[PDB]
């Protein structure tokens with residue numbers, strides 16, 4: 067089979083709607099999101115067109131073939147952050163810091179254009195030729211600010227180990243602290259090679275242990291005091307008490323010089 071001049075070589079990953087494939091021309095290699103069948107694809111295309119930043123995946127354009135929609139994006143040659151996390155170990159702290167600084171740069175950019183990602187996790191954080199982080203998958207992205215006016219979110223979505231606790235508890239909630247929370251779980255995964263809990267709920271023992279400051283337990287015991295102090299400010303239950311990105315940028319570990 068062929069679409070204009072493209073050949074489907076390898077499945078790069080799956081999302082809530084459709085599949086992302088590695089497409090080779092006749093010999094340019096690109097990433098194509100193939101979606102069957104409406105209100106959501108019009109929204110995703112719209113958000114994808116607004117994006118212009120070094121830490122956000124580049125959108126090439128879109129083609130329609132009846133019921134099938136093709137979304138063309140720049141191929142992340144370095145693959146995903148997920149495959150740089152050694153299970154039970156994580157990665158060297160200077161590499162985790164650099165990826166965290168790049169994650170903050172991409173999230174400030176999105177929030178600045180009033181877009182919330184809503185599914186930040188290592189499979190959605192890709193790497194270019196020079197290991198520069200790029201935030202991908204905008205199928206769950208939505209507008210939280212328009213005409214300088216904030217809109218609260220009221221839809222439950224994301225990935226349970228990464229979702230903020232207010233998302234499971236409150237009818238309506240602010241967008242930005244939810245994305246901040248998921249960034250904190252990503253930081254935990256980079257420094258410990260393990261996710262801290264199945265979900266941030268009272269029925270989850272590991273979440274209860276964190277709230278009781280049992281930081282002598284895994285994954286926290288694998289993390290050095292300085293990044294752990296940052297995680298203590300991010301992984302705060304009350305979203306109004308949770309650290310904001312301007313203040314993460316002032317954190318001691320965020321500003322620590324690191325090498326080797």
Ligand SMILES: CC(C)(O)[C@@H]1CCN(c2cc(-n3ncc4ccc([C@]5(C#N)CC56CC6)cc43)ncn2)C1
Pocket residue numbers: 078079080081086088097099123139140141142143144145146189190192202203204
């Ligand atoms: C062949 C090569 C160069 O060796 C490498 C081998 C692993 N590779 C990749 C590349 C990607 N890319 N690249 C661009 C791109 C855009 C969107 C998405 C996503 C969405 N939506 C997150 C999700 C669902 C996958 C992925 C993308 N995803 C994984 N691995 C490429």
